[PDB]
């Protein structure tokens, strides 16, 4: 439901992200679990890891980032019309991950933040609306696909 020019800076934005995937990666899922700790839990491969210190050595952890960003960016930048791109990470959250919706919402709060924490310059009002309004039309589309499974939305 954004306009082109909404769609215009997000992807602007998504750009930044682009230069250092991985590295923004890791730092949304550090951001993610230290600001709320019981999305962790979810994560069986990174339950030994007590500490930033830890979090921030593992690769791994980094590697997750990496992939999870990467997945995102490809829903971004099908502006929208991101039903085949969504459906297969609906599927699998929904399923065999067993993430709730609102943990979708601490995820998108880390994302936001980390690219206010990186990008304070180019992050202005405008662009931190935008991408507020894709990362909310990925979590209503997901929780659309989720309860369309049979599954809460
Ligand atoms: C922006 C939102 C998210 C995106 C783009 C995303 C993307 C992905 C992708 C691409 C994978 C690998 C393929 C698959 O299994 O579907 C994955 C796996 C996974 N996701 Fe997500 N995810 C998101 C949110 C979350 C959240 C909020 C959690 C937990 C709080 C989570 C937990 C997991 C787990 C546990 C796995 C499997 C990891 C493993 O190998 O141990 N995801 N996700």
Known sequence: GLSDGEWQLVLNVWGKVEADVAGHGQEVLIRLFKGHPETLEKFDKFKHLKSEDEMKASEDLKKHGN??????????????????????????????????????????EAIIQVLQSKHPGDFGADAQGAMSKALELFRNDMAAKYKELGFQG
């Open 67 to 108: 992939t999870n960003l990467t997945a995102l960016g490809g829903i971004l930048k099908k502006k929208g019309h991101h039903e085949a791109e969504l459906t297969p990470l609906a599927q699998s959250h929904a399923t065999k991950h067993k993430i709730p919706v609102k943990y979708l919402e601490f995820i998108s």
